[PDB]
Amino acid sequence: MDGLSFVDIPDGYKNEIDQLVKKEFANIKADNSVSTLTNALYTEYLKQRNNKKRRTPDFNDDDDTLFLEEYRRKYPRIDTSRYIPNESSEVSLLGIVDSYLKHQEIVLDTLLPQTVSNQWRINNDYIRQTCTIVEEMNIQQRKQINDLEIYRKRL
């Protein structure tokens, strides 16, 4: 488990260790009908065609275009009424929503900092641990080398 990150390591060692890990891997080796049509639409990459009729039409048609004509009138009156209540308020309704979006944005970046601080704070605690033990390992190795030659010089 133990491998000191702050205290310790070349790219060659990653490439080396990867090969040894690789060799040990060589050894081991809820919705209704809605979901059916939605998954089929996405898989096939084709959206279902809508009513491309109101836009084109034609004068001196028949009973069919008499309907299609009368459709264009009522929707154009609804359109012209739908543009009236927008222009009445105008830009006030738009800029009121623009302000809401600024309150929504700043909240996210506050959380970006809160995460930033606690993430650096955890790493900060690790750092001290790494330096604590790395010294202790240094102490151990020095003592190790002392015996190694001490035992020889006795013999």
Which residues contact residue 105 at a Cβ distance below 8 angstroms, ignoring those fewer than 6 apart?
A: none
- Return the ∠ at Cα 139 (arms to 138 and 142), rounded to 5°: 85
Three-state secondary structure string covering 72-122: HHHHHHHHHHHCHHHHHHCCHHHHHHHHHHHHHHHHHHHHHHHHHHHHHHH
Could you say which residues in the range 32-61 bind another protein, by CB under 8 A? Answer: 38-39, 41-43, 47, 50-52, 54-55
Token output for 57: 């039409």
Is residue 21 part of the contact set for another protein (CB under 8 A)?
A: yes
What is the pattern of x (binds another protein, CB under 8 A) and - over residues 102-131?
-xx--x-----------x--xx-xx--x--
Is residue 81 part of the contact set for another protein (CB under 8 A)?
A: no
How far apart (Å, rounded) are the C-alpha atoms in residues 138 and 130?
A: 12
Is residue 3 part of the contact set for another protein (CB under 8 A)?
A: yes
Residues that bind another protein (CB under 8 A): 1-3, 5, 8-9, 13-14, 16-18, 20-21, 24-25, 27-28, 38-39, 41-43, 47, 50-52, 54-55, 75, 79, 82-83, 86, 93-94, 96-97, 100, 103-104, 107, 119, 122-123, 125-126, 129, 133, 136-137, 140, 143-144, 147-148, 150-152, 154-155
